[PDB]
Design a protein around this ligand. Structure first.
Ligand code: SLZ
Length: 237
């Protein structure tokens, strides 16, 4: 536990990276129990460009920014949307992708924010999806989940009417589980820029991560990794 500058991380030869591991296809443990996903490939490429061995630490999502500030990891890459409140708490890099939150229901279920009046909505705790659900008037209940996939299970089970989540995670879950005929993606409720985070005031590491990200976007690495995971370039445009 310590906030380490880039020079300090450099000499140790290793960088500790905090992530969640329950958010496919961004960061998740695969079927042979190895951490992977778009963010893991990116985090690895960044570490490699900076000459560092990555050490990944997977923790509950809602704990990540707090533990980062306590120095448990040097940076976090775990699909954090930039918000006013979070940007005070931690220092965000330039965004490593752009996305938005979407309504997903069973077929015939709610499609828009207006449709959610009198409805039960499922969201992951500590997320921008939760924050957004709290601002939509007339929702009967906002059920909170430790892990986003547990909200999807409850939607499939009929225990919630609607799951609010990331558009790429919704799209992939439907493909993966062959749910094209059971779920429908509704309105895009908000857009967000998603970024890596450093402990507040760690401007040394912040500069290094920004530099490596910009270098990956220029040299083709970012494109290759985005194409691998999404078949398209998901950078902020
Ligand atoms: N690894 C799980 C992260 S889900 C993050 C969501 N976009 C948010 O910004 O709250």
């Amino acid at each position: 536990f310590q906030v380490r500058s880039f020079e300090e991380i450099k000499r140790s030869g290793e960088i500790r990276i905090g992530t969640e591991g329950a958010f496919p296809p961004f960061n998740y443990f695969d079927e042979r129990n190895q951490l992977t996903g778009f963010e893991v490939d990116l985090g690895n490429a960044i570490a490699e460009r900076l000459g560092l061995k990555p050490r990944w630490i997977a923790q509950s999502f809602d704990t990540l920014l707090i533990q980062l500030n306590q120095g448990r990891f040097d940076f976090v890459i775990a699909s954090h949307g930039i918000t006013e409140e979070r940007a005070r708490a931690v220092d965000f890099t330039n965004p490593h992708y752009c996305t938005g939150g979407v309504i997903v229901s069973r077929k015939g279920g709610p499609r828009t924010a207006k449709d959610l009046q009198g409805k039960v909505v499922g969201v992951q705790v500590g997320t921008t999806y939760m924050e957004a659900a709290q601002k939509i008037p007339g929702i009967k209940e906002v059920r909170t989940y430790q892990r986003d996939p547990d909200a999807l299970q409850d939607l499939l089970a009929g225990r919630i009417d609607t799951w609010i989540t990331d558009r790429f995670v919704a799209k992939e879950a439907i493909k993966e589980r062959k749910l094209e005929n059971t779920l429908q993606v509704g309105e895009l409720v908000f857009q967000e820029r998603v970024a890596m985070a450093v402990a507040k005031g760690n401007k040394s590491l912040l500069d290094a991560l920004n530099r490596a990200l910009a270098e990956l976007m220029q040299d083709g690495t970012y494109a290759r990794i985005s194409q691998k995971w999404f078949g398209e370039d998901v950078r902020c445009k």
